[PDB]
Predict the structure.
Amino acid sequence: LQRDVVLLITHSGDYFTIDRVAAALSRRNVQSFRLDTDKFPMTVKIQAYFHQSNSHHQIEYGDITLNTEQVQAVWMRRLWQPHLSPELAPQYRDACTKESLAVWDGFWDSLRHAHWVDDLQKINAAENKLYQLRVAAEVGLVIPPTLVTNNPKEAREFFEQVNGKMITKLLKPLSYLLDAETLRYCPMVFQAQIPKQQELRAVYVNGNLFVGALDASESCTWQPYELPKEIIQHLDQFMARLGLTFGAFDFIVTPLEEYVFLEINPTGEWGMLERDLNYPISEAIADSLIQN
Amino acid sequence: LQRDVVLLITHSGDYFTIDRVAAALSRRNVQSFRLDTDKFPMTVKIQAYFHQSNSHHQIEYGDITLNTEQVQAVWMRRLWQPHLSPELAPQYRDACTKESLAVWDGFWDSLRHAHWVDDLQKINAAENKLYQLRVAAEVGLVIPPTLVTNNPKEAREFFEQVNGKMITKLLKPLSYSMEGSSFFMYTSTVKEEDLLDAETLRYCPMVFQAQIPKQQELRAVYVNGNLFVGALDASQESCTWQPYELPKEIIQHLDQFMARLGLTFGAFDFIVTPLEEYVFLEINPTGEWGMLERDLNYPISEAIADSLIQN
């Protein structure tokens, strides 16, 4: 009962990113507790006690017991779902997956005093890509002209506005140990193709930028880049509006040096950038967790 | 160029409540637009265009075109799964349910200026039953002692704590109905079941509560400060609803609770004890109410119609 623990929320097969951040946290002599969400409900134990004004919540994992009142910060790195056991009666499987997810929901409310990087309700709202396009334009970023629709007849005829210089995109694609399949039966998002000089992955941590250029003119060769201060000002405003300390952006830089917002992934991967270019992303994250 | 339409969000198989609300709205000379969410994407046409700070959104359903700037209020009655599958597909079916839900998600953001009953994010947060118990306890409602756990060792100490008078319930119940009830039946717990190692219980966390002496079980529909309460009566039986009226001090607490949740509408489940204590059990933010309007002649649809046009 006293706030000095940083709760690291990820899954059991998470490596490099979780390790480097954990190591940076300890280098400030701050305690951390690694919680593998996939190890619940079969290994992790939850207790949530409600009695009129008094509450009590604790989690047990790897034989270490953590009371939620010891938590000053949450690093919301990955929320995987519960591994409910091979075999097991299918009639129980979905009732107890859905049941174990509601437990997770109740658990976060007990952690409302910790400083979250990032708030889960904020992450979920920011995953709304049409909302993303609104906020990007509202803070002054260029966005590609985009049409959302089911009627193939407009997209047709939007495609014949953009002069065949059109792309199709999944709203909730395919990232959510490997995936990849194409939906050519439910296209609903169409964007103008934007003249491309470079593709950027810009990792935002609490106002710090770490950008890789994929250069079109884990993914292959990443080239170091700096964003102009004006672009960073736009992301600062953008992130404040989404309520996010951390996020991974996808930008196209045009031949006229315009920076076109494509999307943000609030929980997008960053280890590749720290790995290939030695960006100190793990230290920026660790510093934002104890900065509250 | 006239924001005066009330958008009714439901599905094609909804029937009694949706009609009553529309009729109440039109008797107030207010246009309404009933949007059947399940009829998207195969029948409803959505169009949203985004160009550098300027955006435009429209819906067409049943040969009526709705522009989102004409909507003054949104009634969030039911948000259904998108219906695909005349030509039923496999694993592609769920991917495009996900695609179609994101379109609706983009679409709700365009209606953020309208008066929602209720706001979807507020509904989503209020569906957290553990969150409910804290807020109820903070605004002065009596709540049952509660444990949520997959730890069989703590379920046993809780059972001793409440002196062996304890019930179990699933947090997210498995029933015929979507978002099931709080008492169309639940299980009383004797110590053999706690001992019964844990079964499922360490991979199926449960809710354990102190058993509360019940004189009546109430479903109290809260509409914008107005209460409509029915008491459930047996006589495998034949459940009927009959009327109840809440003390104004509980209604004052119910006002505080709903303000904290940012909700205008909800369906409460209360136990009234033989010593006439009112014990909060849960709220269903999208709970059914048509039963009460029909069986008890509560003018719920009138109260809903009024909260939508009061803005």
